[PDB]
Ligand binder design. Sequence first.
Ligand SMILES: Cc1c(-c2ccccc2)cccc1N1C(=O)c2cc(CN[C@H](C(=O)O)[C@H](C)O)c(OCc3cccc(C#N)c3)cc2C1=O
Ligand SMILES: Cc1c(-c2ccccc2)cccc1N1C(=O)c2cc(CN[C@H](C(=O)O)[C@H](C)O)c(OCc3cccc(C#N)c3)cc2C1=O
Ligand SMILES: Cc1c(-c2ccccc2)cccc1N1C(=O)c2cc(CN[C@H](C(=O)O)[C@H](C)O)c(OCc3cccc(C#N)c3)cc2C1=O
Ligand SMILES: Cc1c(-c2ccccc2)cccc1N1C(=O)c2cc(CN[C@H](C(=O)O)[C@H](C)O)c(OCc3cccc(C#N)c3)cc2C1=O
Lengths: 125, 126, 122, 126, 125, 126, 125, 126
Amino acid sequence: AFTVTVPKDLYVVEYGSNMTIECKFPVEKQLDLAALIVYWEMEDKNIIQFVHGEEDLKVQHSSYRQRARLLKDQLSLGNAALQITDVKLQDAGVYRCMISYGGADYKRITVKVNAPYAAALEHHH
Amino acid sequence: AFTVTVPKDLYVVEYGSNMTIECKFPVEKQLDLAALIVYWEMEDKNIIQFVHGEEDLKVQHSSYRQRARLLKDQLSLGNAALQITDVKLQDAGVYRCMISYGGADYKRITVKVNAPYAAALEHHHH
Amino acid sequence: AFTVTVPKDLYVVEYGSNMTIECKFPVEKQLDLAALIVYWEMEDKNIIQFVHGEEDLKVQHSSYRQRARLLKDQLSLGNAALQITDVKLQDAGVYRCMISYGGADYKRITVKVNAPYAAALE
Amino acid sequence: AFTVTVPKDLYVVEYGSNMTIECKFPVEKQLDLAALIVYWEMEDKNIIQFVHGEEDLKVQHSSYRQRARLLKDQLSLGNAALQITDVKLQDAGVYRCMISYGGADYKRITVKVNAPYAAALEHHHH
Amino acid sequence: AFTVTVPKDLYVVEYGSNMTIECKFPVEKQLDLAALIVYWEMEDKNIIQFVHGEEDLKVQHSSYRQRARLLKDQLSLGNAALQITDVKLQDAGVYRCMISYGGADYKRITVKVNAPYAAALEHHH
Amino acid sequence: AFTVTVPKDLYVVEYGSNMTIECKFPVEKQLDLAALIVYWEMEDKNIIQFVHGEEDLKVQHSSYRQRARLLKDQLSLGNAALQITDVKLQDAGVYRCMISYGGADYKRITVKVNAPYAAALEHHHH
Amino acid sequence: AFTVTVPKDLYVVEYGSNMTIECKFPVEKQLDLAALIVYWEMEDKNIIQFVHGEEDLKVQHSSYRQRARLLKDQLSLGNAALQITDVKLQDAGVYRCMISYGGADYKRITVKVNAPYAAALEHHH
Amino acid sequence: AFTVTVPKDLYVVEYGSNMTIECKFPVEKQLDLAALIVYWEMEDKNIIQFVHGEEDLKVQHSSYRQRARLLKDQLSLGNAALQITDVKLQDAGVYRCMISYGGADYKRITVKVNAPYAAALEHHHH
Ligand SMILES: Cc1c(-c2ccccc2)cccc1N1C(=O)c2cc(CN[C@H](C(=O)O)[C@H](C)O)c(OCc3cccc(C#N)c3)cc2C1=O
Ligand SMILES: Cc1c(-c2ccccc2)cccc1N1C(=O)c2cc(CN[C@H](C(=O)O)[C@H](C)O)c(OCc3cccc(C#N)c3)cc2C1=O
Ligand SMILES: Cc1c(-c2ccccc2)cccc1N1C(=O)c2cc(CN[C@H](C(=O)O)[C@H](C)O)c(OCc3cccc(C#N)c3)cc2C1=O
Ligand SMILES: Cc1c(-c2ccccc2)cccc1N1C(=O)c2cc(CN[C@H](C(=O)O)[C@H](C)O)c(OCc3cccc(C#N)c3)cc2C1=O
């Protein structure tokens, strides 16, 4: 039974810092990159799409361009690691990772963002 | 006795990714920011200088301008966490973290960088 | 604004000599010897660990037994004195002094070694 | 007869510490992992599900993730030791260790957690 | 993957009547009694301890002697069926079946009992 | 008569695995952390020095940092257990555990490491 | 912090002479002999087990019987001084002194043995 | 009702190999060395005589010099294991293990030794 698991389903990240959130999927024997699909989204905004060889920036929401990378070396180990760079308050919420590799599954991760008064103030209006 | 520890003295980072390397120092009860000095460098190039309550960028090497920050929320938990954004091959090397909090200590961490042939090529020629 | 100062950035010594390299930190009025830490290092082999009251050889490297000693009463000067007796050719390299006294700082000191042909055979 | 024995059926742990609780089971000569099953439970919440050779974590209750661990090294010594890091007041209660190794058996252990007023106030709010 | 199944997670019986809870486990073709262990308990009260062929009854709780049986006829059908005679009010609660047959797994069956006023008052006092 | 016991004076471990070796000493009712000293060494290279309540981290030999820890949880039970993670070929030899707890005693444990050819070649040449 | 020190971690004695190796332990006030444990050994061979104010010679190795002494006078000054009489070539090697006095620590002392050709010849054969 | 039990009443070993033959006896909770007696023999040739603390080999047959040892490590486990190193053809025959521990009992174990033509030839001629 193909099951994606998450070591953490909650992350607490500092405003402006970098973030790595992980989804584990089973990789027995060598990895077949052609049969792997990884989809990373947050509340209906597409962050990352990995079909066949490389990502696809066709659906990547503008709030994530140049800011989101999928750690490719980690796929061989069974790790779909999403990195977001320079975390902002609008990065708090529910992330979903969909993984297709033989079987198909997905998991949910919650990111809370702590921010100082100045940043919160700019985000308030 | 004051000793900085490292949960990992070796990091293998993929070219172009973000990196977080940690140094632990003992904090009991609530952290005293006024007594805390945190210093990160690599091969005699200063990355971070955290004195009193804020980073000091007077000595920061040009390869770390807006590329390196210390996670301050982790300081309360006794964790001096250095974050390097967009790791390049020039970032592979030996990092030293100097912590002063009552006592004083430092530790070493090795960072290796794996890279595709394109990036390795541009670094090799330049 | 705590800062460590080095009088000479480079020391040139001949083989079998006695080299005294030295960093100096701002000591004002009485020296609170309890709040002083002095590391002396050379390319990640540590030479001195002056913590609290006296030295600590529990981490000292093999290349400095009985050879190196930090002049102690020198610390009322602010003097954090390292002297290598019977200087060897492998003592040439980059030295570092860490000083923690209120603030903290460290400085580098390049040390080159001249030797005759008899010793150079490693 | 196959029989699990517990040297302590009661542990008094301090909030925030680590506890390792033991379940002894008879192992003759060298252990055979394929025949060994270890369930660790607490009021019908699964902590550990150790079948074949490694754990099973899609059964693991949420309040125990990255906190609980079966000490594998000591299984060959007839000990099924569970370690809970950073004990919280929710960790109080009756733990069960089910062990299948040819025979089958299970024993109960009681954990009581002491906490200062501050932490007990935090837990009391939730 | 050995896993105990349950047809009815819930049983609703009436006081004085008789109860038949069943925990199914996978058997195929011949049943090897010399490798079968069934354990029925309810809230740390042991009911039956079926170990290698026959139940041990110095293990049985006092409130279950002469009233609880396992159907050794039904074990060949992949069925650990516990039956309670004259269901009193103290027979309500969560039951557990532990089963070791090659693998090992357990499951829980909750039981609610209905009683008239008289029996309810005898239980209350 | 204060006696340290070792349930195994010989371990045969596989290169790359984890190893936990046990020393037992008598603790009747509560443990007196203030009166407990625990040394772990392996052929004149110190591994653990547990004095008062915490490990001493500068006595420790370089080849064992990041890889050796004393499992404090089990001290209450009278078990000075040493875990070495990611066992190396150099970890083979005679371990000694010294214990002071009222009385004092020490015992010896022989560790042998099996390894496949690749690791044995690395250790043979370096 | 209890700590045993050694004035000399190396002795070079002479085959046939008398040897005295010392281990310093910090003694405050007058010596409380009830809490002092001195354990001199050499390559897993017990030499002196000074406990409770006396020497314990039963586990003492045969080769050190009536040749090994502990200068009790030095104990009051903070000195554990093991003396060996008539040094043979077997006495070369590493000695360990273990001292428990409030705290506990141990030190190592290396003994080298010079010897004429006759002694070396009988030892070699 | 004291009773010695043999897991294997028959052993088939190779020449020059090592063999261990076991005899189980009930050790309840903890072993009393002062009330334990273990005889091992083969064809009325005395092999091991374990009385009180450890073996005393006065009546040791001259054919079991250097050969046999009693696994004491296993005595506290209710196991009297005779270990014979360097199995020779002289060792085939019936072994008896005789245990006194409260009660007493003995058991018989047959040992057959396989051997190549060379060793069988030297045994046949002498
Ligand atoms: C030594 C130390 C310790 C420490 C102290 C004792 C023992 C072990 C560790 C603990 C925490 C922080 C630091 N800890 C500092 O607190 C610090 C501060 C500065 C800035 N010092 C200024 C300066 O003068 O540059 C001064 C304000 O004036 C450093 O800069 C190193 C540097 C920079 C440029 C050239 C050279 C050389 N050669 C060396 C290096 C360091 C540094 O490790
Ligand atoms: C664990 C298990 C499993 C199983 C094993 C691993 C994973 C999933 C399921 C499967 C079938 C049967 C059993 N399976 C047993 O085969 C068994 C056997 C005994 C009897 N063993 C005797 C004894 O313990 O009295 C004897 C001393 O050995 C039990 O006794 C429960 C009991 C009785 C009294 C106090 C306490 C406590 N605390 C616990 C409990 C159990 C029990 O679940
Ligand atoms: C450990 C220690 C310390 C010490 C404690 C913690 C840290 C640093 C030092 C200080 C003073 C004395 C000792 N300190 C002892 O107080 C002692 C006592 C005995 C006798 N203990 C009995 C026995 O062994 O018969 C036992 C009660 O039964 C020893 O015997 C060593 C020995 C003998 C035979 C086999 C093996 C092995 N493997 C080891 C060795 C020692 C020994 O260093
Ligand atoms: C071993 C021993 C020794 C002895 C022990 C150690 C060293 C040297 C001598 C001394 C005196 C008597 C015995 N010494 C026993 O003390 C004993 C006790 C029993 C048990 N007695 C039962 C009872 O009445 O409780 C009886 C069954 O009824 C035996 O029979 C056990 C038995 C049963 C079935 C098959 C075989 C075989 N083959 C053997 C045989 C024996 C037997 O030599």
